[PDB]
Amino acid sequence: AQYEDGKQYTTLEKPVAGAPQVLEFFSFFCPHCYQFEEVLHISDNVKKKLPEGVKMTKYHVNFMGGDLGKDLTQAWAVAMALGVEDKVTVPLFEGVQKTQTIRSASDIRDVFINAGIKGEEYDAAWNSFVVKSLVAQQEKAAADVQLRGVPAMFVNGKYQLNPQGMDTSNMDVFVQQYADTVKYLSEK
Protein backbone atom coordinates (compact mmCIF):
# COMPACT_ATOMS: atom_id res chain seq x y z
CA ALA A 1 0.00 0.00 0.00
CA GLN A 2 1.01 3.68 0.11
CA TYR A 3 0.43 3.92 3.84
CA GLU A 4 1.85 0.86 5.70
CA ASP A 5 1.86 -0.02 9.35
CA GLY A 6 5.50 0.27 10.43
CA LYS A 7 6.21 2.85 7.75
CA GLN A 8 4.50 6.23 8.28
CA TYR A 9 2.86 5.01 11.46
CA THR A 10 2.89 2.11 13.90
CA THR A 11 -0.03 0.42 15.57
CA LEU A 12 -0.52 0.11 19.31
CA GLU A 13 -0.73 -3.57 20.23
CA LYS A 14 -2.67 -2.31 23.27
CA PRO A 15 -5.28 0.19 21.99
CA VAL A 16 -6.44 2.95 24.27
CA ALA A 17 -10.21 3.28 24.49
CA GLY A 18 -11.84 6.72 24.77
CA ALA A 19 -8.62 8.61 23.94
CA PRO A 20 -8.74 12.07 22.39
CA GLN A 21 -9.09 11.97 18.57
CA VAL A 22 -5.77 13.66 17.80
CA LEU A 23 -3.37 13.51 20.73
CA GLU A 24 0.05 15.18 20.71
CA PHE A 25 2.79 14.97 23.40
CA PHE A 26 5.71 17.35 23.75
CA SER A 27 8.30 18.82 26.15
CA PHE A 28 9.71 22.32 26.25
CA PHE A 29 13.06 20.53 26.73
CA CYS A 30 12.63 18.48 23.58
CA PRO A 31 14.75 19.75 20.65
CA HIS A 32 12.61 18.14 17.92
CA CYS A 33 9.54 19.60 19.67
CA TYR A 34 11.08 23.02 19.32
CA GLN A 35 11.47 22.34 15.60
CA PHE A 36 7.89 20.96 15.32
CA GLU A 37 6.56 24.13 16.85
CA GLU A 38 8.88 26.95 15.73
CA VAL A 39 10.05 25.80 12.33
CA LEU A 40 7.57 23.16 11.14
CA HIS A 41 4.26 24.29 12.75
CA ILE A 42 3.06 20.68 12.70
CA SER A 43 0.05 21.05 15.01
CA ASP A 44 -1.11 23.87 12.87
CA ASN A 45 -0.75 22.19 9.52
CA VAL A 46 -2.39 19.07 10.87
CA LYS A 47 -5.43 21.09 11.98
CA LYS A 48 -5.65 22.64 8.51
CA LYS A 49 -6.19 19.14 7.05
CA LEU A 50 -8.36 17.39 9.61
CA PRO A 51 -12.09 16.74 8.87
CA GLU A 52 -14.82 18.80 10.47
CA GLY A 53 -15.70 17.88 14.06
CA VAL A 54 -12.35 16.49 15.16
CA LYS A 55 -10.73 17.85 18.34
CA MET A 56 -7.03 18.34 18.77
CA THR A 57 -5.30 17.80 22.11
CA LYS A 58 -1.70 18.59 23.11
CA TYR A 59 -0.06 17.55 26.41
CA HIS A 60 3.30 18.26 28.16
CA VAL A 61 5.32 15.37 29.65
CA ASN A 62 7.39 14.93 32.84
CA PHE A 63 10.24 12.63 31.80
CA MET A 64 12.54 15.42 30.50
CA GLY A 65 14.28 18.06 32.60
CA GLY A 66 13.66 16.62 36.07
CA ASP A 67 12.09 19.07 38.50
CA LEU A 68 11.65 21.90 36.02
CA GLY A 69 10.08 19.34 33.67
CA LYS A 70 7.26 18.72 36.13
CA ASP A 71 6.95 22.46 36.75
CA LEU A 72 6.54 22.88 33.02
CA THR A 73 3.71 20.33 32.99
CA GLN A 74 1.85 22.18 35.74
CA ALA A 75 2.40 25.46 33.79
CA TRP A 76 1.03 23.88 30.65
CA ALA A 77 -1.97 22.75 32.78
CA VAL A 78 -2.33 26.47 33.68
CA ALA A 79 -1.91 27.53 30.04
CA MET A 80 -4.73 25.12 29.09
CA ALA A 81 -7.10 26.28 31.83
CA LEU A 82 -6.60 29.99 31.04
CA GLY A 83 -6.68 29.23 27.34
CA VAL A 84 -3.39 31.02 26.78
CA GLU A 85 -1.47 28.20 25.04
CA ASP A 86 -0.91 30.47 22.06
CA LYS A 87 0.70 33.28 24.04
CA VAL A 88 3.20 31.27 26.04
CA THR A 89 4.24 28.35 23.83
CA VAL A 90 6.89 30.28 21.98
CA PRO A 91 8.41 32.18 24.92
CA LEU A 92 8.54 28.94 26.94
CA PHE A 93 10.41 27.10 24.16
CA GLU A 94 12.82 29.95 23.64
CA GLY A 95 13.20 30.48 27.37
CA VAL A 96 14.17 26.84 27.89
CA GLN A 97 16.16 26.13 24.70
CA LYS A 98 17.31 29.43 23.15
CA THR A 99 18.05 32.03 25.78
CA GLN A 100 18.15 29.57 28.71
CA THR A 101 16.58 32.03 31.07
CA ILE A 102 14.10 29.51 32.48
CA ARG A 103 15.64 27.82 35.50
CA SER A 104 12.87 27.81 38.07
CA ALA A 105 9.10 27.90 38.44
CA SER A 106 9.49 31.62 39.02
CA ASP A 107 11.15 32.09 35.66
CA ILE A 108 8.31 30.10 34.10
CA ARG A 109 5.91 32.45 35.87
CA ASP A 110 7.66 35.55 34.43
CA VAL A 111 6.90 34.34 30.91
CA PHE A 112 3.17 34.33 31.62
CA ILE A 113 3.42 37.74 33.33
CA ASN A 114 5.18 39.16 30.33
CA ALA A 115 2.62 37.49 28.11
CA GLY A 116 0.03 39.49 29.98
CA ILE A 117 -1.63 37.01 32.32
CA LYS A 118 -1.91 38.67 35.70
CA GLY A 119 0.10 37.45 38.68
CA GLU A 120 -2.92 36.87 40.81
CA GLU A 121 -4.68 35.03 38.03
CA TYR A 122 -1.68 32.84 37.31
CA ASP A 123 -0.97 32.01 40.97
CA ALA A 124 -4.65 31.26 41.52
CA ALA A 125 -4.70 28.95 38.47
CA TRP A 126 -1.35 27.37 39.46
CA ASN A 127 -2.71 26.28 42.80
CA SER A 128 -6.22 25.34 41.75
CA PHE A 129 -7.54 21.79 41.81
CA VAL A 130 -8.77 22.22 38.23
CA VAL A 131 -5.10 22.48 37.38
CA LYS A 132 -4.36 19.45 39.55
CA SER A 133 -6.74 17.25 37.54
CA LEU A 134 -5.50 18.74 34.30
CA VAL A 135 -1.93 17.76 35.31
CA ALA A 136 -3.35 14.33 36.18
CA GLN A 137 -4.92 13.96 32.72
CA GLN A 138 -1.65 14.78 30.99
CA GLU A 139 0.03 12.12 33.03
CA LYS A 140 -2.72 9.56 32.57
CA ALA A 141 -2.79 10.03 28.79
CA ALA A 142 0.99 9.59 28.58
CA ALA A 143 0.79 6.54 30.79
CA ASP A 144 -1.97 4.95 28.70
CA VAL A 145 0.28 4.81 25.64
CA GLN A 146 3.57 3.74 27.18
CA LEU A 147 5.12 7.04 26.22
CA ARG A 148 8.91 7.27 26.56
CA GLY A 149 9.65 9.68 23.70
CA VAL A 150 8.47 13.01 22.33
CA PRO A 151 7.37 14.59 20.05
CA ALA A 152 4.62 12.06 19.59
CA MET A 153 1.19 11.98 18.00
CA PHE A 154 -1.55 9.43 18.56
CA VAL A 155 -4.71 9.07 16.50
CA ASN A 156 -7.88 7.60 18.00
CA GLY A 157 -5.98 5.76 20.70
CA LYS A 158 -4.78 3.24 18.11
CA TYR A 159 -2.20 4.82 15.81
CA GLN A 160 1.14 6.48 16.42
CA LEU A 161 2.89 8.73 13.91
CA ASN A 162 6.29 7.58 12.74
CA PRO A 163 8.19 10.61 11.37
CA GLN A 164 11.44 8.65 11.03
CA GLY A 165 9.93 7.00 7.94
CA MET A 166 9.23 10.24 5.98
CA ASP A 167 11.56 12.22 3.67
CA THR A 168 13.34 15.08 5.49
CA SER A 169 15.22 16.69 2.57
CA ASN A 170 12.49 19.27 2.23
CA MET A 171 10.74 20.51 5.39
CA ASP A 172 7.56 21.62 3.66
CA VAL A 173 7.19 18.18 2.16
CA PHE A 174 7.85 16.59 5.52
CA VAL A 175 4.94 18.47 7.10
CA GLN A 176 2.47 17.68 4.37
CA GLN A 177 3.30 14.04 4.38
CA TYR A 178 2.95 14.14 8.15
CA ALA A 179 -0.34 15.99 8.05
CA ASP A 180 -1.75 13.82 5.26
CA THR A 181 -0.81 10.77 7.30
CA VAL A 182 -2.78 12.07 10.27
CA LYS A 183 -5.72 12.65 7.96
CA TYR A 184 -5.46 9.13 6.54
CA LEU A 185 -5.27 7.65 10.03
CA SER A 186 -8.12 9.89 11.05
CA GLU A 187 -10.39 8.43 8.37
CA LYS A 188 -9.35 4.82 8.98
DSSP calls for 124-183: HHHH-HHHHHHHHHHHHHHHHTT--SSSEEEETTTEEE-GGGS--SSHHHHHHHHHHHHH
* Rounded alpha-carbon distances, angstroms, from residue 12 to 96, 156, 183: 32, 11, 18
Hey, how many other C-beta atoms are within 10 angstroms of the C-beta on 64?
Answer: 18
Alpha-carbon dihedral sign for residues 164, 168, 172, 176: negative
Q: Taking the alpha carbons of 167, 169, 175, 177 in that order, is the dihedral positive or negative?
A: negative
153 Cα distance to chain centroid: 8
Resolution (A): 2.3
Q: Where are the domains of the chain?
A: 1-188
Residues, the chain, total? 188
* Consecutive H or E run containing 187: helix 171-187
Contact criterion met (CB below 8 Å) for 166 and 177: yes
Close Cβ partners of 150 (under 8 Å, ≥ 6 residues apart)? 25, 26, 27, 30, 32, 33, 61, 64
Topology of domain 1-188 in CATH is Glutaredoxin (3.40.30)
Q: Give the list of residues 6+ apart from residue 151 with CB closer than 8 angstroms, or none.
A: 24, 25, 26, 30, 32, 33, 36, 42, 163
d(CA 35, CA 62): 19
